[PDB]
């Protein structure tokens, strides 16, 4: 998080949405769940924040 | 002094489940390192003299 400025990328995509607090935990790699599986999935790879 | 602003714990836990992806499963790691014949040998293979 403290080195973000020093990391150069081709681009960044910002994905915007409203999710229930308890379901925030599903917004991660290696996850399963109603959101992780049917609404919004992330690849098991490196990401920004 | 936690949870004051910018206090963090340097350690974190592994959530190891029996129902997750392989990359997220636990592995036991053993790393062998040899001392290459400085002092007189203490370990040798199954050889005859």
């Amino acid at each position: 998080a403290t080195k973000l400025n020093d990391l150069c990328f081709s681009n960044v995509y910002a994905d915007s949405f409203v999710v229930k607090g308890d379901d925030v935990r599903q917004i991660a790699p290696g996850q399963t769940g109603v959101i992780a599986d049917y609404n919004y999935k992330l690849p098991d790879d490196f990401m920004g924040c | 002094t936690p949870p004051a602003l910018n206090c963090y714990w340097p350690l974190n836990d592994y959530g190891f489940y029996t129902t997750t992806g392989i990359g997220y499963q636990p592995y036991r790691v053993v790393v062998l390192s040899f001392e290459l014949l400085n002092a007189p040998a203490t370990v040798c293979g199954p050889k005859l003299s």
Partner: antibody
Amino acid sequence: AQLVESGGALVQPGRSLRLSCAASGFTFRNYAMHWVRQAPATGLQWLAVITSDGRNKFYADSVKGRFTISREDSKNTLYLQMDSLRGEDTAVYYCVTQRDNSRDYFPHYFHDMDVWGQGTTVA
Amino acid sequence: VLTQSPLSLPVTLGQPASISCRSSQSLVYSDGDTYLNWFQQRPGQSPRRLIYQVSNRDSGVPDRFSGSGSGTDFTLKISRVEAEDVGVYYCMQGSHWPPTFGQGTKVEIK
């Protein structure tokens, strides 16, 4: 996780019968509930499921529209309302659920079915 | 639809046995897993699970129980069949709704 069925009886074709199943050893509210029946005719036949929130109810075509599945969380009890019973419906009715609710959503509650009651005879 | 074979398995006490299950369709689910389980129902008792996800065993299940398989073709294996292993072994698929069971294999001890 223990399931205890009751309500089995002999009922003439055309009439109705209502089963119940008491749960103990686990939190009833946190699991989906199923009915499965056993007979030489079908072996083990899945009939219906009601989800943990009591909202979604799915039925096998063989009972769809004739049987209704329901639950009373306040009594930790699963029910099955069987209307217009036929001779073909003779079977031992088992109360079935799961121990693992890690993925409490469709269709994952059909994957383990590892908790079974003693079963009650309906004729 | 699941079909098991043999319908009845005549195994001498202390000898190994296996039960076959064949599906009308691949039991590989949309997430790549396979939801093919095996249950044993002992006379006077309800069904209990022994093997799940083709080859995993439930806690409390003797190490003599194992299994393997893929696609449509699955097998339940018992390294040695004991007197207490008498019962009907069912295969179950949860991959395709409605979930289904095989007709069950009656394993008896000779």
